[PDB]
């Protein structure tokens, strides 16, 4: 028996597995229960905390997924499945995992816990591409990264209910915060150096716990990959959460709050997913409906009110955004798009687009996208539409809300660092219009191109091993930098400054899509108001 | 007596005067009068033809500039004085100037008719700038010009009333073209061939005689300096007319608020030139710059609708336009009250002047809208750099007052059937006396156009004459073919086109054709902003 993998945790004993890199051994202990299965008169309900176990909880597996929608677009193909389930679904989902040195680190390592995306609809801890085994190796840190719920079963609110109160989903990676804070250490990891890192609804995630108090006391720096909080998919006001709920009751049969949330509660899973994208108010790309709610609870305000309001001295942060941060989403309901064609529209094509795109705002909102995404000189040219449209999708709903949260947080007190990930990874199988496709990052982050049964140059080996050295040294000091050879200066309100990650040298530049950012960060708004 | 400088009108007969020019003489013919003089009951009132007379009118100088406001910002300085009377001022001046070739012309030629700018406040045809003798001398075309009445005299309208109907400057200006019609065959002069040109006030004058089908027939071309009758500066609705007559009265003594318009206009009728001329910068709704008090009124007479609205609706199958603008249009405007701006220095303004400013350059506009334009007018890479902020408020007026209306006007006109060229002017005159920040600034070009260079008392350079010979050409070739291109190896000007967009560089160097007036920058003024206007 490897005294290595048997762990005592607050609630029982833990056996967990000894995995393999190209570096060497690590400690991996997965499937462990962190709340009481949200399950029968539990669902909609926030978590408990796991009640102690007697004998030895069995670790060396990922547990299930939570229930969510699975991707039918394109069947079968690479770019969609990698992000579909990849363990059984099930309603009892909430599991977290932990990875550490071999053996076991005898004294505190930094702990970096991973919060995956997925609009919020989806995701799971347990997908290839967030393997922990190269990052704990190469930069000897501890990995956490947990499950939590959700579609409806995370986010479906009834505001003012206690049935179904909302963000039980955010809670569920709270309770995963407060278990760290509670038993880290006895796997090496130090509960005063927790670096919390997420990518797009995870980004989002990570943000929120930044803007809620009873969350801020868990971890000591952030990482925001592609998402922020303030984003306009990523919370949804009152009102419309009841609608969107009242709704779903509707299409699965059911009628009180009391008694819409005790018939909700009756119907099998799978049902409650058969019917969430028909809630939505309008036609849209980037919009999910069952999304965390400002209820002035876990949120006393809109995370832009937070924002623009907070002092942000002490913290540091690490933020930034892909090449094209649009592209991905166009496939999903855009007209004219496709990953099989080259997707060369029409002007008439590009305007319906933008009102799917910018769903849900006045003409005269429409009629300013419209002006400052025409190059009125080429205003019919296809390629060049098909450009703007992508812009104005990531602009709109990830390069913008990026740029606000780093000029805020830097102009507030904070130390923060930005990025635009620029590579194109050898192994991509989206087309080349594409480019840069939201999510793309995440592999050289953690590691992925080192797996020797898989198809990455030596480049990218060499550079996927620059990235992990920068994540892993803002985790330990709040900087990225490395000791002095060029470097990663500061983001500034004014200065604006961020690099470039790819194959090439660190590149220095000026500006988060400015031009483009002054329009929906500044003017839009006012528009809105009037 | 000389048989060459003797000529019958309808009107009766005319003795005129003999021109020295570097290449040659000139017949000229000057202070022809056409109208009775607007004096006293006629003040305000559209414009009589000038009665037939006995014996011999001597046409041999220009006659009195039209009551306006004389510029004193800077006195004794050459930029501004320029532009300011050169005789005395009257109400005595509706008369018009013909030069035509020495020996008279056997054959009939062609007639190029000028109607000067000045913000219908303001402008004589008797000014050195606009002296005919060069264009006649190297190109051989007839040309006309005429003074018409401005300010409160040729604009101050109570619409509905008989007494004060508001355009009658544009009426003078009509009448003008009516003698030419009727008399410039006369001097050798072709009737059928007559093409209009004007700068700034007398370019927008020109698009709104487009626009007016009494005015149509009188004319076959036209060209547009810098202004376009649907700039927002050219013309006033009818409550605004009247607000601002209204209040002109009330601060003069009338009558002793509205009322009677009869009485209001009597008593206006009352009060010497002079006195209406100090308060007429007083009438203005708020401090602006490219803001004029008596302009041409949309009262569905002269103009039926707005110029925007016709020139939307409207055929053109058969019209040729020469159109253009100075590669600087805002930049004079900005000294006469833009906060941070002088001649006499660097004008580098700071961000929150630049604010102020915005809202002197865009008057009468919602928070909101002056909000769009500072979105549009920001580099937020550099958003406090005071050289591009000063750059950036030239740009905001220039555009907003000349570039967009003229751009519009030009694709429309050849989207809806005329064949139509356009221009920038680009070279910065060697003798220009305004600071070097501001470029090449309005009004500008109109030296070249004439010929100025040629005169042998100025001091211009050899390159500047050759230029000025060449961009003479240019405006007569368009005169006689409607095409300003040479009838060879040297490089074409093609027709602009509301897609393709093509216009040429004028400057020392040989045409260069580009793409665009401003079209990023001019979406915003002509396509989303009336939007907003609207919701
Ligand atoms: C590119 O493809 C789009 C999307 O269409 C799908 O994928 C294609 C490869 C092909 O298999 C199509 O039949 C698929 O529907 C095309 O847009 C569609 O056009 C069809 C008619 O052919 C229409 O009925 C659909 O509603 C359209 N779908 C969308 C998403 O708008 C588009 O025509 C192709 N563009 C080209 C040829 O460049
Ligand atoms: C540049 O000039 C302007 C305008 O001022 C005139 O010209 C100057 C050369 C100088 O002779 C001034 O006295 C003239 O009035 C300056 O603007 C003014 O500043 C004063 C007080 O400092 C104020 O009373 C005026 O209203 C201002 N004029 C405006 C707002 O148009 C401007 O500051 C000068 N720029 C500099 C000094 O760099
Ligand atoms: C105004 O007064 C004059 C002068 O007596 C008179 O002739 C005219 O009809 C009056 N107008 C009106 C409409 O009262």
């Given at each position: ?61 990922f547990?299930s997924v939570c229930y969510q929608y699975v991707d039918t677009l394109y069947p079968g193909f690479e770019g969609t499945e990698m992000w579909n389930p990849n363990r059984e679904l099930?309603?009892?989902c ?20 991973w919060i995956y995306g997925g609009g919020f609809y989806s995701g799971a801890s347990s997908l290839d591409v967030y393997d ?13 990264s947990?499950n939590y719920?959700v579609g ?46 997420g990518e797009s609804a995870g980004a989002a995630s ?19 990959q592609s998402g ?5 998919w ?39 997913v058969?019917?969430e994208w ?7 790309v980037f919009?999910f ?33 892909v090449?094209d941060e649009?592209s991905y989403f166009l496939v999903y ?6 990953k ?58 990830v ?26 990874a050898?192994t991509l199988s989206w087309?080349?219009?594409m480019?840069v496709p939201h999510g793309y990052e995440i592999e050289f982050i953690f590691?992925i ?5 898989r ?76």
């Amino acid at each position: 028996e490897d005294a290595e993998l048997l762990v005592t945790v607050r609630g029982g004993r833990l056996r967990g597995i000894r995995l393999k890199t190209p570096g060497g051994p690590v400690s991996a202990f997965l499937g462990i229960p962190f709340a009481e299965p949200p399950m029968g008169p539990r669902r909609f309900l926030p978590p408990e905390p796991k009640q102690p176990w007697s004998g030895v909880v069995d670790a060396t597996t990922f547990q299930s997924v939570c229930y969510q929608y699975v991707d039918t677009l394109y069947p079968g193909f690479e770019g969609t499945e990698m992000w579909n389930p990849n363990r059984e679904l099930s309603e009892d989902c909430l599991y977290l995992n932990v990875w550490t040195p071999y053996p076991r680190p005898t004294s505190p390592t930094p702990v970096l816990v991973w919060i995956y995306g997925g609009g919020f609809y989806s995701g799971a801890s347990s997908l290839d591409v967030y393997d922990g085994r190269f990052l704990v190796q190469a930069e000897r840190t501890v990995l956490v990264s947990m499950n939590y719920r959700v579609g409806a079963f995370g986010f479906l609110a009834l505001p003012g209910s206690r049935e179904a109160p909302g963000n039980v989903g955010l809670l569920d990676q709270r309770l995963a915060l407060q278990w760290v804070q509670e038993n880290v250490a006895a796997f090496g990891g130090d509960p005063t150096s927790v670096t919390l890192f997420g990518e797009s609804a995870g980004a989002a995630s990570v943000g929120m716990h930044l803007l809620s108090p009873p969350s801020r006391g868990l971890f000591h720096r952030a990482v925001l990959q592609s998402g922020a909080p303030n984003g306009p998919w990523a919370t949804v006001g009152m009102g419309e959460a009841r609608r969107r709920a009242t709704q779903l009751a509707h299409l699965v049969g059911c009628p009180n709050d009391t008694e819409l949330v005790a018939c909700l509660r009756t119907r099998p899973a799978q049902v409650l997913v058969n019917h969430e994208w028909h809630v939505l108010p309008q036609e849209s790309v980037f919009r999910f409906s069952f999304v965390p709610v400002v209820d002035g609870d876990f949120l006393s305000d809109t995370p832009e009110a937070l924002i623009n309001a907070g002092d942000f001295h002490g913290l540091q942060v690490l933020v930034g955004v892909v090449k094209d941060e649009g592209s991905y989403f166009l496939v999903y309901g855009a007209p004219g798009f496709s990953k099989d064609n080259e997707s060369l529209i029409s002007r008439a094509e590009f305007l319906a687009g933008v009102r799917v795109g910018v769903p849900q705002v006045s003409d005269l909102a429409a009629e300013a996208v419209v002006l400052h995404y025409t190059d009125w000189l080429h205003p019919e040219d296809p390629a060049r539409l098909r450009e703007a449209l992508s812009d104005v999708v990531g602009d709109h709903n990830v390069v913008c809300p990026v740029a606000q949260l780093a000029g805020r947080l830097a102009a507030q007190g904070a130390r923060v660092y930005a990025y635009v990930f620029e590579h194109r990874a050898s192994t991509l199988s989206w087309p080349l219009w594409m480019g840069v496709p939201h999510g793309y990052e995440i592999e050289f982050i953690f590691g992925i191109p080192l797996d020797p049964s898989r198809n990455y140059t030596a480049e990218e080996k060499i550079f996927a091993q620059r990235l992990m050295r920068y994540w892993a040294n803002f985790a330990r000091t709040g900087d990225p930098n490395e000791p002095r050879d060029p470097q990663w200066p500061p983001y500034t309100a004014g200065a604006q400054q961020y690099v470039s990650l790819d194959l090439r040298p660190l590149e220095v530049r000026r500006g988060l899509r400015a031009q483009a950012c002054a329009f929906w960060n500044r003017f839009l708004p006012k528009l809105l108001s009037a």
